[PDB]
Amino acid sequence: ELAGIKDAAPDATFRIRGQKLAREPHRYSGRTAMRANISVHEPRQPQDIDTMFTFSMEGNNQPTAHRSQVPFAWAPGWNSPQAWNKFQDEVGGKLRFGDPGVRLFETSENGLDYFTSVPARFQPQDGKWRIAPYYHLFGSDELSQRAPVFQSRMPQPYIKLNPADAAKLGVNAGTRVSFSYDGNTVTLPVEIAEGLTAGQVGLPMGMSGIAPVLAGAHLEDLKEA
Amino acid sequence: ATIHVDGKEYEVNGADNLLEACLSLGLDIPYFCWHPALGSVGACRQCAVKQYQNAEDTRGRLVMSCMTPASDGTFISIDDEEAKQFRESVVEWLMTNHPHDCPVCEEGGNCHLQDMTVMTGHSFRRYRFTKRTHRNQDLGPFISHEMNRCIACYRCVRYYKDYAGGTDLGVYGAHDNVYFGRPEDGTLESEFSGNLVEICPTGVFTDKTHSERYNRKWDMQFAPSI
Amino acid sequence: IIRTPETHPLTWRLRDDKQPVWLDEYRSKNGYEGARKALTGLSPDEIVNQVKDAGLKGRGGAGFSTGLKWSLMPKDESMNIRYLLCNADEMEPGTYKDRLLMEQLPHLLVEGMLISAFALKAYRGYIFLRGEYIEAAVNLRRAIAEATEAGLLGKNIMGTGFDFELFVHTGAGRYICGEETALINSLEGRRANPRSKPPFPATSGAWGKPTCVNNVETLCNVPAILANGVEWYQNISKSKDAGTKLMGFSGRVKNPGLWELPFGTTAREILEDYAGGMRDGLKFKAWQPGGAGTDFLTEAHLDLPMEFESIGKAGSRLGTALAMAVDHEINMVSLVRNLEEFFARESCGWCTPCRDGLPWSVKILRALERGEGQPGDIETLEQLCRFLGPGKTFCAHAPGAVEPLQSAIKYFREEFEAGIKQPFSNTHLINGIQPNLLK
Amino acid sequence: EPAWQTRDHLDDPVIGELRNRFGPDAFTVQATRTGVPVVWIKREQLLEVGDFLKKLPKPYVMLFDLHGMDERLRTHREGLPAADFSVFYHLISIDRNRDIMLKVALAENDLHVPTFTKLFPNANWYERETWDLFGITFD
Amino acid sequence: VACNLCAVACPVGCISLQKAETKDGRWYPEFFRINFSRCIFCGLCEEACPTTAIQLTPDFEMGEYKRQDLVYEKEDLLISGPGKYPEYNFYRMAGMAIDGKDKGEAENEAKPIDVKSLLP
Amino acid sequence: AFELSAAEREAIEHEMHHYEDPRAASIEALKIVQKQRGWVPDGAIHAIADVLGIPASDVEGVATFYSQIFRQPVGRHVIRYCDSVVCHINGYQGIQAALEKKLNIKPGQTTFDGRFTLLPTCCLGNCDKGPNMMIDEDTHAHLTPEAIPELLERYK
Ligand SMILES: NC(=O)C1=CN([C@@H]2O[C@H](COP(=O)(O)OP(=O)(O)OC[C@H]3O[C@@H](n4cnc5c(N)ncnc54)[C@H](O)[C@@H]3O)[C@@H](O)[C@H]2O)C=CC1
Ligand SMILES: Cc1cc2nc3c(=O)[nH]c(=O)nc-3n(C[C@H](O)[C@H](O)[C@H](O)COP(=O)(O)O)c2cc1C
Ligand code: SF4
Ligand code: SF4
Ligand code: SF4
Ligand code: SF4
Ligand code: SF4
Ligand code: FES
Ligand code: FES
Ligand SMILES: [Ca+2]
């Protein structure tokens, strides 16, 4: 069932009229000086035995080459991102000689039946707080939050509460509420979410110490601390 | 539909405008405001071609190739002297107020305006007066903002509003004092604001993360990835 | 000057003390009878056909046929939401006809808008009126309220079964708002950038609905046609452009003013019989027929009839037929400089050639006015006039901007050549680099 | 009229003699900015064309150049015969003060040309250089 | 201004530099190295410099014992004067705001007109 | 620190009643705020965007596009003198010089007390009685430079 990944891209023996595909443009600069601090002898350029590309400009990057994997767009007289107009059969449509990547499976001849197990209406249990996931674009990815440029962009971790439940707890926005999940009494400042339904606590997934596995879980011991 | 460019017969798609009809065949027309995904608004007036309705027509008319449909039986000329002179004049008019900022610009060698300045063969400056300047806004950690380099091609407002659905980028100003940005300073809160670094033909909206550790396009080693 | 109802079908009902005419006084002197005949004895289609047979050209400045424009609305009955717009902006310099048309006879405009809304079956009408006309705005609101009270605006007008609502939209003072598509854009609360044509406003105009934009003088012309007939309107003057136009000379003349004259009256008659000629100690150098966006003409063109085709044959335009006289004391370079400053500071800023080439002409004329002109500026102005003609720019503001510049280049080239005193110097000597010297 | 314009060169008398000798369907004429009549000639008639140019009344007694060319990546080959490789022979007639460039088209697999050493003895090193740098074999 | 034009105009490729930016906003090379064992003294880097920063001075006595010592760094190319072009500054022409240079203070540039200005 | 009053909000809503789009009342909303406050401050843009529902960038573009929608503070009275072609033939430059000599400022600047804001404007539509000058709601025709000091004393 993973047999389609052979057709995702051609092998390392694929050549455009005998030559490989270039990873860097034809006017790449400083070949004989970018490593001269370490040693004045420029070594052999690395060889890519795995794929059809090469770590050099001795390769084919013409817009009319019979290939689908395009490292970058460049045409003579077209240096902008608008140089992609030369790499397509029609401008704005599909890529010339087909787009890369193939679907693993086709549509089945017949489908599934009706899923009968309907759920029950959400009744808020006292004490236990259902965790509502609040995904953010900057912060819910495992690796993107490690970027130092996202730390100046991601919002502060706020636990989101209904106005009714926050008034019941007596907490106002800005104050810290401590919650315990598996022996971790972690404090978060409170934001008020009118659109959130009563009986839930809004938590941002993928943050520091708040995993996406927390979605749908309960939360006992939600007190102001 | 069938069109005629400089006496050459081309089979085109008749539901399309003439600009990408010619761009599909590999025919070079300078253009700024048109984008394949956004559409045509006829703003930059750079895509002028001389249209003839008969096979024997001397005068013709300078029409917008992004605004004229590629119907069956249009005889357009791109490399005509009148059309080339008008396109060079439009490039010159865009170059009257442009700053002397190409070495210190993050899109040097990646600039659409550079390609269309060299494409029309304009290299002599007879404009001798002052150039208008604009202040800059702090658009957040991602987008570096330099409004002096703008040419008022309206691509940013079109994409950000009519395509991305964002509400904080707009067009303000006057006759020649046109500004493109926010009503104040602050982060662009759209989740698709990053495409402004490639939608903008000039170096107004640039990648600040790339601008931290900056190298030119020919210095880049690229790869296709997911 | 006396104005009978026959040869002055619009200006016969003003007051000698220059006061507005209200509903009782307007209705006393045969008012709202063309509207009565239109709403009671004629279908909308035959009203449109009557206006088309009358040969009523639009008095906005282009002279397009109003009946044919009304015939371009979609004939499908699924689009019952329709708009009629009255372009009361009149932001062109040298134009003052609309101010007199609505400050003293607002009910004439209201009646004409009623007739034109019934002809198009337009459910709503807006007067896109400029912000500076304040007394005109007060008179328009008073006239609308008075006509609404006495069964002429609102629901079931006269008992025919046609419902029409009229509004006054006061503009915020931009010259480009007078253009019909830009008028539609500013009516919808957006920036006043003009739209591409086609699609013309008659099919997809205001809020995507069928919408017809007309000048004030056309809507003031229509009720005389609907009351006194079509063949009577064709029997006012023996000219191809039928009707009466509000003409008049302005600018350093003896008696500047506004007079309703038939088409075909020569421009010397307006200067002499009405304006009285030049003032004391003044001579005549040039004139400009249709406001600021028209080519200058000379003394030899003074004995020329004031029609669209006659002025259009002699390298100019009729425009609004409100002529401006330029004397010999006025320097033409500074005059064209002021015209270009107005045309460049009032540009909408959408498209490249006007926006980034009109200030270049402004700066060149600033250098010529101070005598700091350099060799190659007049050729630059000529190529600028060539490349800012019709079809190059998105709208028609820039061809009208460059018409006086090319006319002053053509007729008064010796005044423009007198502003060049210093040699051409664009670069400066960089120490250490020998410059290139083209020959 | 500038000297750098693409001149197709049908006004050369040598083109007329070649049309009258080998017929109107034996070779193709290329319009270039070289200032040279460029004649694409079939491989079988290369020796016949060489002998014909050697035995003209004011003949081409000079083999100026002889070298190959890789046409596998040339995208703009409009007006040109289909070819993966090519070999050009640049010949000069001194008395005519004229010169011609004869190009023969070769496929990627059938890379053998008849030799030019017998007509011009200085073709030996040029054919060796063409074989060394392009892999084209000379029979 | 670390614009990398000399590195790409070099036919040998013996110039290596990386752009750095100070707190004001002006550009400079973080490092600038030339492999003089590779350079052919063709003068294309001086020809392609838009700021007239890199210059080939008339000095030839550059004999060395180890060719690793022939790799000159930024501390060895930067001199204490203007060189062959004495009175040219690129930032007096550029439209980028730097220290001591507000918008509109460049050559042939006007003061910035705000969009909120009352003048039509 | 901005907050729309009752009268401005009710007038804004009544202007929304006139059209089929709340966007179309943006120009009259800005004119209402300009009439009440003398000009349109920074918080008024966001308040109008809140009451109409359109983005604040659209309100900013509309406000900065039009000349008589003031985005900077003005004086007690705004003088708008015509500078177009017919008044240039009629000599508007004498009136401009008279106003510059009296108010001791430039066109576009305000006096230190905040009395008059002198501004050029386009054609006033009264070219047969040129030159003209439009103070806040009053137009003046057949102007002479000597009548400028007598004209400016009617606005304290
Ligand atoms: N204040 C004033 O009175 C001013 C008047 N003008 C006049 O405005 C003119 C330019 O007007 P524009 O609207 O830009 O151009 P235009 O002349 O093409 O259009 C004018 C009218 O003709 C109609 N029209 C023309 N061809 C049509 C077609 N094929 N289908 C449907 N409708 C058609 C338009 O709908 C519009 O109502 C100038 O020539 C000048 O005379 C210019 C400036 C100021
Ligand atoms: C820049 C520009 C400004 C215009 N200003 C006005 C105007 O102020 N008043 C007007 O009636 N027409 C004006 N027009 C003409 C309009 O396009 C159009 O003719 C008008 O809305 C209706 O004209 P009509 O009476 O022939 O139907 C202007 C046109 C342009 C290009
Ligand atoms: S945007 Fe383009 S033309 Fe403008 S300064 Fe940058 S590189 Fe130069
Ligand atoms: S900022 Fe860029 S995208 Fe926007 S109008 Fe200017 S040049 Fe076009
Ligand atoms: S010519 Fe272009 S920029 Fe000028 S007013 Fe018309 S659309 Fe606007
Ligand atoms: S002079 Fe040397 S460093 Fe400069 S471009 Fe030539 S080879 Fe490169
Ligand atoms: S030395 Fe000159 S060409 Fe090289 S990066 Fe610096 S400014 Fe650019
Ligand atoms: S690309 Fe056609 S006008 Fe801009
Ligand atoms: S030109 Fe001044 S009022 Fe018209
Ligand atoms: Ca690998």
Short mmCIF file of N, CA and C in Angstrom, two decimals, chain C residues 269-365:
data_model
loop_
_atom_site.label_atom_id
_atom_site.label_comp_id
_atom_site.label_asym_id
_atom_site.label_seq_id
_atom_site.Cartn_x
_atom_site.Cartn_y
_atom_site.Cartn_z
N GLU C 269 -20.31 85.44 -31.00
CA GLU C 269 -21.56 86.04 -30.53
C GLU C 269 -21.66 86.00 -29.01
N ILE C 270 -21.22 84.90 -28.39
CA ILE C 270 -21.23 84.82 -26.93
C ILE C 270 -20.24 85.80 -26.33
N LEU C 271 -19.11 86.03 -27.00
CA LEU C 271 -18.11 86.95 -26.49
C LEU C 271 -18.55 88.40 -26.66
N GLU C 272 -19.25 88.71 -27.75
CA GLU C 272 -19.60 90.09 -28.08
C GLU C 272 -21.01 90.47 -27.66
N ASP C 273 -22.02 89.70 -28.07
CA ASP C 273 -23.40 90.08 -27.80
C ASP C 273 -23.76 89.91 -26.33
N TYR C 274 -23.11 88.97 -25.64
CA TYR C 274 -23.43 88.66 -24.25
C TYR C 274 -22.31 89.04 -23.29
N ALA C 275 -21.10 88.54 -23.52
CA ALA C 275 -19.98 88.87 -22.65
C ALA C 275 -19.44 90.28 -22.89
N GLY C 276 -19.73 90.87 -24.04
CA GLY C 276 -19.30 92.22 -24.33
C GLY C 276 -17.87 92.37 -24.77
N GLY C 277 -17.14 91.27 -24.93
CA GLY C 277 -15.74 91.34 -25.32
C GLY C 277 -14.81 91.48 -24.13
N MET C 278 -13.59 91.91 -24.43
CA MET C 278 -12.58 92.08 -23.40
C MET C 278 -12.84 93.36 -22.60
N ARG C 279 -12.14 93.48 -21.48
CA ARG C 279 -12.33 94.60 -20.57
C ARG C 279 -11.54 95.81 -21.06
N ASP C 280 -11.45 96.84 -20.22
CA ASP C 280 -10.80 98.08 -20.61
C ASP C 280 -9.29 97.89 -20.69
N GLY C 281 -8.71 98.20 -21.85
CA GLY C 281 -7.28 98.09 -22.04
C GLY C 281 -6.77 96.68 -22.24
N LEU C 282 -7.65 95.73 -22.56
CA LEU C 282 -7.28 94.34 -22.72
C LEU C 282 -7.48 93.90 -24.17
N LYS C 283 -6.64 92.97 -24.60
CA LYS C 283 -6.75 92.35 -25.91
C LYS C 283 -7.08 90.87 -25.75
N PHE C 284 -7.45 90.24 -26.86
CA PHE C 284 -7.83 88.84 -26.87
C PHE C 284 -6.70 88.01 -27.46
N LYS C 285 -6.30 86.96 -26.75
CA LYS C 285 -5.25 86.07 -27.22
C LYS C 285 -5.75 84.67 -27.53
N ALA C 286 -6.49 84.05 -26.61
CA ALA C 286 -6.94 82.69 -26.83
C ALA C 286 -8.25 82.46 -26.09
N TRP C 287 -8.86 81.31 -26.35
CA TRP C 287 -10.05 80.90 -25.61
C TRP C 287 -10.10 79.38 -25.59
N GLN C 288 -10.90 78.86 -24.67
CA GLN C 288 -10.98 77.43 -24.42
C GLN C 288 -12.44 77.07 -24.20
N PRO C 289 -13.04 76.23 -25.06
CA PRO C 289 -14.50 76.12 -25.10
C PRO C 289 -15.15 75.37 -23.95
N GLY C 290 -14.59 74.23 -23.55
CA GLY C 290 -15.32 73.32 -22.69
C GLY C 290 -14.74 73.06 -21.32
N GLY C 291 -14.32 74.11 -20.63
CA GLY C 291 -13.72 73.94 -19.32
C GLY C 291 -12.23 73.68 -19.43
N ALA C 292 -11.64 73.26 -18.31
CA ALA C 292 -10.18 73.17 -18.24
C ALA C 292 -9.63 72.03 -19.08
N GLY C 293 -10.42 70.99 -19.33
CA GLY C 293 -9.94 69.86 -20.09
C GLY C 293 -10.19 69.94 -21.58
N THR C 294 -9.91 71.09 -22.18
CA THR C 294 -10.17 71.31 -23.60
C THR C 294 -8.99 72.06 -24.22
N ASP C 295 -8.80 71.84 -25.52
CA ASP C 295 -7.71 72.50 -26.24
C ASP C 295 -7.99 73.99 -26.41
N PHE C 296 -6.91 74.77 -26.34
CA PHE C 296 -7.01 76.20 -26.59
C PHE C 296 -7.23 76.47 -28.07
N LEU C 297 -7.98 77.53 -28.37
CA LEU C 297 -8.20 77.99 -29.73
C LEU C 297 -7.83 79.46 -29.82
N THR C 298 -7.70 79.96 -31.04
CA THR C 298 -7.19 81.29 -31.30
C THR C 298 -8.31 82.22 -31.75
N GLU C 299 -7.93 83.45 -32.14
CA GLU C 299 -8.90 84.43 -32.62
C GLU C 299 -9.54 83.99 -33.93
N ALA C 300 -8.80 83.28 -34.78
CA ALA C 300 -9.34 82.80 -36.04
C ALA C 300 -10.43 81.75 -35.86
N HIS C 301 -10.48 81.10 -34.70
CA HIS C 301 -11.50 80.11 -34.39
C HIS C 301 -12.70 80.70 -33.67
N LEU C 302 -12.74 82.03 -33.50
CA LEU C 302 -13.84 82.66 -32.78
C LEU C 302 -15.14 82.62 -33.57
N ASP C 303 -15.06 82.67 -34.90
CA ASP C 303 -16.25 82.64 -35.75
C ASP C 303 -16.57 81.20 -36.16
N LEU C 304 -16.74 80.36 -35.15
CA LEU C 304 -17.00 78.94 -35.33
C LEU C 304 -18.23 78.55 -34.52
N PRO C 305 -19.15 77.77 -35.10
CA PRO C 305 -20.37 77.40 -34.37
C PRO C 305 -20.08 76.50 -33.18
N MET C 306 -20.92 76.62 -32.16
CA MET C 306 -20.67 75.98 -30.87
C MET C 306 -21.40 74.64 -30.80
N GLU C 307 -20.98 73.72 -31.66
CA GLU C 307 -21.52 72.37 -31.70
C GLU C 307 -20.43 71.37 -31.33
N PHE C 308 -20.83 70.11 -31.19
CA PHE C 308 -19.85 69.07 -30.89
C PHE C 308 -18.94 68.81 -32.08
N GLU C 309 -19.53 68.63 -33.26
CA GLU C 309 -18.76 68.24 -34.44
C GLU C 309 -17.95 69.39 -35.01
N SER C 310 -18.44 70.62 -34.91
CA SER C 310 -17.72 71.76 -35.48
C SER C 310 -16.46 72.07 -34.68
N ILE C 311 -16.57 72.10 -33.35
CA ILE C 311 -15.39 72.31 -32.52
C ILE C 311 -14.49 71.08 -32.56
N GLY C 312 -15.08 69.88 -32.64
CA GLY C 312 -14.29 68.67 -32.77
C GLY C 312 -13.55 68.55 -34.09
N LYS C 313 -14.02 69.23 -35.13
CA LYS C 313 -13.31 69.23 -36.41
C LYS C 313 -12.06 70.10 -36.35
N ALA C 314 -12.09 71.18 -35.58
CA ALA C 314 -11.01 72.15 -35.53
C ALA C 314 -10.03 71.89 -34.39
N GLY C 315 -9.82 70.63 -34.04
CA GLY C 315 -8.83 70.26 -33.04
C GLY C 315 -9.14 70.71 -31.62
N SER C 316 -10.39 70.58 -31.19
CA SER C 316 -10.78 70.92 -29.83
C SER C 316 -12.03 70.11 -29.49
N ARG C 317 -12.71 70.50 -28.41
CA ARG C 317 -13.93 69.83 -28.00
C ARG C 317 -14.97 70.86 -27.59
N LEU C 318 -16.25 70.49 -27.72
CA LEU C 318 -17.31 71.35 -27.21
C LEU C 318 -17.32 71.33 -25.69
N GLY C 319 -17.24 70.15 -25.09
CA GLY C 319 -17.22 70.04 -23.64
C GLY C 319 -18.54 70.47 -23.03
N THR C 320 -18.45 71.35 -22.04
CA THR C 320 -19.62 71.91 -21.38
C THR C 320 -20.08 73.21 -22.01
N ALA C 321 -19.40 73.66 -23.07
CA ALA C 321 -19.71 74.90 -23.80
C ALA C 321 -19.66 76.13 -22.91
N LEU C 322 -18.87 76.09 -21.84
CA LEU C 322 -18.68 77.23 -20.95
C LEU C 322 -17.26 77.74 -21.18
N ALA C 323 -17.14 78.69 -22.10
CA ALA C 323 -15.84 79.09 -22.62
C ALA C 323 -15.09 79.98 -21.64
N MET C 324 -13.77 79.91 -21.72
CA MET C 324 -12.87 80.74 -20.92
C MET C 324 -12.00 81.56 -21.86
N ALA C 325 -11.90 82.86 -21.59
CA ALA C 325 -11.14 83.78 -22.42
C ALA C 325 -9.81 84.10 -21.75
N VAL C 326 -8.73 84.01 -22.53
CA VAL C 326 -7.37 84.27 -22.05
C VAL C 326 -6.84 85.48 -22.80
N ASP C 327 -6.46 86.52 -22.06
CA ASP C 327 -6.03 87.78 -22.64
C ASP C 327 -4.53 87.75 -22.95
N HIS C 328 -4.04 88.86 -23.51
CA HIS C 328 -2.63 88.95 -23.89
C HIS C 328 -1.71 89.21 -22.71
N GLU C 329 -2.24 89.71 -21.59
CA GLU C 329 -1.40 89.94 -20.42
C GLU C 329 -1.02 88.65 -19.72
N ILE C 330 -1.84 87.61 -19.87
CA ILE C 330 -1.62 86.35 -19.17
C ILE C 330 -0.58 85.54 -19.93
N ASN C 331 0.50 85.17 -19.25
CA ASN C 331 1.50 84.29 -19.84
C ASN C 331 0.95 82.88 -19.95
N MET C 332 1.09 82.27 -21.12
CA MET C 332 0.51 80.95 -21.34
C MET C 332 1.28 79.85 -20.63
N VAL C 333 2.58 80.03 -20.41
CA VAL C 333 3.37 79.00 -19.73
C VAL C 333 2.93 78.86 -18.28
N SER C 334 2.74 79.98 -17.58
CA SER C 334 2.26 79.93 -16.21
C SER C 334 0.81 79.45 -16.13
N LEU C 335 0.01 79.78 -17.15
CA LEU C 335 -1.39 79.35 -17.17
C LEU C 335 -1.49 77.83 -17.33
N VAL C 336 -0.71 77.28 -18.26
CA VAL C 336 -0.65 75.83 -18.44
C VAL C 336 0.00 75.17 -17.22
N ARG C 337 0.92 75.86 -16.56
CA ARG C 337 1.49 75.35 -15.32
C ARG C 337 0.43 75.20 -14.24
N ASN C 338 -0.44 76.21 -14.09
CA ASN C 338 -1.53 76.11 -13.12
C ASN C 338 -2.51 75.01 -13.49
N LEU C 339 -2.83 74.89 -14.78
CA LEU C 339 -3.71 73.82 -15.24
C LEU C 339 -3.12 72.45 -14.93
N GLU C 340 -1.82 72.28 -15.14
CA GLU C 340 -1.18 71.00 -14.89
C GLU C 340 -1.04 70.72 -13.40
N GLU C 341 -0.83 71.75 -12.57
CA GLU C 341 -0.85 71.56 -11.12
C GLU C 341 -2.20 71.06 -10.66
N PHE C 342 -3.28 71.64 -11.19
CA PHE C 342 -4.62 71.15 -10.86
C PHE C 342 -4.82 69.72 -11.35
N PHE C 343 -4.38 69.43 -12.58
CA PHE C 343 -4.63 68.12 -13.16
C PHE C 343 -3.78 67.02 -12.53
N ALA C 344 -2.64 67.37 -11.94
CA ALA C 344 -1.77 66.40 -11.30
C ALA C 344 -2.05 66.24 -9.81
N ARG C 345 -2.55 67.27 -9.14
CA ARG C 345 -2.91 67.14 -7.74
C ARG C 345 -4.31 66.59 -7.53
N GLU C 346 -5.11 66.48 -8.59
CA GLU C 346 -6.46 65.94 -8.49
C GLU C 346 -6.60 64.60 -9.20
N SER C 347 -5.47 63.98 -9.56
CA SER C 347 -5.50 62.66 -10.16
C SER C 347 -5.89 61.62 -9.12
N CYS C 348 -6.59 60.58 -9.57
CA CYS C 348 -7.05 59.53 -8.67
C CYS C 348 -5.92 58.62 -8.22
N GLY C 349 -4.84 58.53 -8.99
CA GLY C 349 -3.67 57.77 -8.60
C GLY C 349 -3.71 56.29 -8.92
N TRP C 350 -4.63 55.84 -9.77
CA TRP C 350 -4.71 54.42 -10.08
C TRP C 350 -3.62 54.00 -11.06
N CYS C 351 -3.62 54.59 -12.25
CA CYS C 351 -2.82 54.06 -13.35
C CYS C 351 -1.58 54.90 -13.59
N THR C 352 -0.56 54.24 -14.16
CA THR C 352 0.80 54.78 -14.21
C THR C 352 0.97 56.09 -14.98
N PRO C 353 0.52 56.25 -16.24
CA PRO C 353 1.01 57.39 -17.03
C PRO C 353 0.58 58.74 -16.50
N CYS C 354 -0.70 58.90 -16.15
CA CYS C 354 -1.17 60.13 -15.52
C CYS C 354 -0.46 60.39 -14.20
N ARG C 355 -0.46 59.38 -13.31
CA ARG C 355 0.04 59.55 -11.94
C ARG C 355 1.52 59.90 -11.90
N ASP C 356 2.33 59.27 -12.76
CA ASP C 356 3.77 59.47 -12.74
C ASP C 356 4.29 60.27 -13.93
N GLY C 357 3.41 60.88 -14.72
CA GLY C 357 3.88 61.73 -15.79
C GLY C 357 3.32 63.13 -15.74
N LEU C 358 2.13 63.32 -15.16
CA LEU C 358 1.64 64.68 -14.96
C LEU C 358 2.50 65.50 -14.00
N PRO C 359 2.96 64.99 -12.84
CA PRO C 359 3.91 65.79 -12.04
C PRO C 359 5.22 66.10 -12.75
N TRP C 360 5.67 65.23 -13.66
CA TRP C 360 6.86 65.54 -14.45
C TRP C 360 6.62 66.75 -15.34
N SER C 361 5.44 66.82 -15.97
CA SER C 361 5.08 67.99 -16.76
C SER C 361 4.93 69.22 -15.88
N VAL C 362 4.42 69.04 -14.65
CA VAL C 362 4.30 70.14 -13.71
C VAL C 362 5.67 70.71 -13.37
N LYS C 363 6.64 69.84 -13.10
CA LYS C 363 7.98 70.29 -12.75
C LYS C 363 8.68 70.93 -13.95
N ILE C 364 8.44 70.40 -15.15
CA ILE C 364 9.01 71.00 -16.36
C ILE C 364 8.44 72.40 -16.58
N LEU C 365 7.14 72.56 -16.37
CA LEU C 365 6.53 73.88 -16.52
C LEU C 365 6.92 74.82 -15.39
#
